[PDB]
Structure formats: C-alpha cells, structure tokens
Amino acid sequence: ENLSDVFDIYAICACCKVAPTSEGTKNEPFSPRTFRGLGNKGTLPWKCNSVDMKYFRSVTTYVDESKYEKLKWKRERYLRMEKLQNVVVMGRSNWESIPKQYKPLPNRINVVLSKTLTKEDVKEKVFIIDSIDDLLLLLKKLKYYKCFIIGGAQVYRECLSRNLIKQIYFTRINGAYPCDVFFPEFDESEFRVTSVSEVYNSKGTTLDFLVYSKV
Numbered sequence: 001e002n003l004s005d006v007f008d009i010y011a012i013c014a015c016c017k018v019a020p021t022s023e024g025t026k027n028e029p030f031s032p033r034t035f036r037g038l039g040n041k042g043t044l045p046w047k048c049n050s051v052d053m054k055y056f057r058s059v060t061t062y063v064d065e066s067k068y069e070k071l072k073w074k075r076e077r078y079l080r081m082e083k084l085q086n087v088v089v090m091g092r093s094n095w096e097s098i099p100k101q102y103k104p105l106p107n108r109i110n111v112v113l114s115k116t117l118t119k120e121d122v123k124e125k126v127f128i129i130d131s132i133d134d135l136l137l138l139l140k141k142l143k144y145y146k147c148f149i150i151g152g153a154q155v156y157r158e159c160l161s162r163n164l165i166k167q168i169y170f171t172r173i174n175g176a177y178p179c180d181v182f183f184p185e186f187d188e189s190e191f192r193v194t195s196v197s198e199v200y201n202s203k204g205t206t207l208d209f210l211v212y213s214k215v
C-alpha cells in the first residue's frame with residue numbers, strides 16, 4: 001500500500017531561482033526547473049521572508065481534530081493487515097541551521113534524521129532517527145495528524161526516491177540568489193498541481209504557493 005497516503009507524508013519547501021556563476025561544471029543556467037534554489041552556506045538563499053515563514057508555520061502547525069478519526073481508522077486498519085500535532089522531519093544540517101530561539105519548532109513534534117547525533121548531545125525535545133525506516137517505525141507507533149518533511153536536500157531526495165511523498169507544498173521565491181543546495185529532481189509525471197495561490201509581495205520580492213498531489 002501507499003505508505004505516503006497511509007501515514008500522510010508530505011513535503012514542504014521553498015525555492016528561488018539560482019544566480020549565475022563564472023566557472024564551474026555545475027552552473028545550470030538553462031535548467032528545466034526555474035525554481036530549484038534551496039540553500040546557501042547552511043542558510044536560506046534569501047533573507048527572512050515573513051510571508052513564507054507565516055505560511056510554513058500555518059501549514060505545518062494546522063490540525064483538524066475532526067478529520068483525525070478517519071486517519072486513525074486508516075492506520076489502525078493498515079496496521080492489522082501486517083494533544084493533536086503534526087510531525088516535522090528535518091535533516092541534521094537543516095536542524096543545525098535553525099537558530100536556537102526556534103528549536104524545537106513549537107506546536108509540532110520534532111524529528112531529526114541523523115546517524116551521528118545522540119540524546120546526550122541534543123538537549124531539545126526531539127526524536128532522533130537514523131533512517132527513513134526508523135521514521136516509519138516511529139510513525140507506526142505515534143499519534144499525529146500530518147507528517148511534514150521540511151528539509152534539507154538529502155531528506156527530500158530519499159523520500160521522493162522511495163515514493164514516500166503524498167503531497168508537496170512548494171513556495172516559489174521570485175528572486176535569484178546564490179545557492180549551493182538545490183531541490184532534488186523527481187519524476188514530475190507522478191504528480192499534478194492541485195493548488196496555485198495568488199501572488200504575494202514580501203518587501204518587493206514576489207512569491208506564490210503551489211501544491212502538488214500524488215497521482
């Protein structure tokens with residue numbers, strides 16, 4: 001069965017256009033994907049975007065007590081054949097990239113993917129897992145609404161490669177910036193755009209919110 005559907009595994013990210021270079025066999029000035037800029041020097045390519053930060057927080061925070069049961073029954077069902085909050089999953093780099101005055105992300109169950117970190121090290125309240133396999137084990141015995149994959153690059157890749165992504169909330173940052181991290185490529189035929197928001201202006205830079213769903 002589609003584990004992404006059974007455990008509501010979604011992906012949420014923001015990407016901007018990549019700024020050119022001058023020398024490197026990697027500069028993709030004609031990439032078929034205009035918005036693929038994910039990070040730069042362990043940080044977001046652009047500056048604190050309040051409009052997107054608000055969005056990300058509303059989407060990853062929102063829970064609907066009502067619709068839970070139907071989810072609960074779905075999982076209880078799948079399991080035999082073998083406070084409400086969403087889960088947020090992030091790679092170690094992304095986790096370390098987040099300023100302390102934000103970790104752990106509030107109103108959300110925090111999970112970090114790592115092979116090095118340990119409980120003695122990390123003092124914040126977050127589950128540490130060593131593989132997507134262990135992520136499924138955790139989800140299997142955890143009570144949550146939706147599960148959001150929030151980065152970085154390596155975590156997106158693995159999940160899209162295993163077809164563990166049911167939906168992708170993609171913010172398009174209409175601006176070019178230097179980037180050393182890009183959104184991993186995936187077969188776009190298995191998805192279709194289901195939501196295309198109106199345009200927004202954050203201090204002059206525009207941005208929109210697209211939502212893809214698995215076919």
Ligand SMILES: NC(=O)C1=CN([C@@H]2O[C@H](COP(=O)(O)OP(=O)(O)OC[C@H]3O[C@@H](n4cnc5c(N)ncnc54)[C@H](OP(=O)(O)O)[C@@H]3O)[C@@H](O)[C@H]2O)C=CC1
Nearest residue numbers: 013014039042043091092093094113114115151152153154
């Ligand atoms: N624009 C956006 O929406 C987002 C941008 N970013 C940006 O992306 C960049 C970070 O991305 P990237 O460098 O790819 O890093 P990631 O955040 O994916 O973290 C990489 C690390 O996560 C761990 N990890 C990845 N896969 C697994 C796995 N299967 N099992 C266990 N651990 C795993 C490893 O930790 P370990 O080495 O300890 O084993 C690994 O080295 C930053 O610049 C950040 O700011 C991040 C999220 C979103």
Ligand SMILES: CCc1nc(N)nc(N)c1-c1ccccc1
Nearest residue numbers: 012013014052053056150151171
């Ligand atoms: C607010 C920036 C942001 N916007 C969107 N649309 N998606 C994301 N995944 C993030 C993000 C990036 C790194 C760490 C935590 C969240």
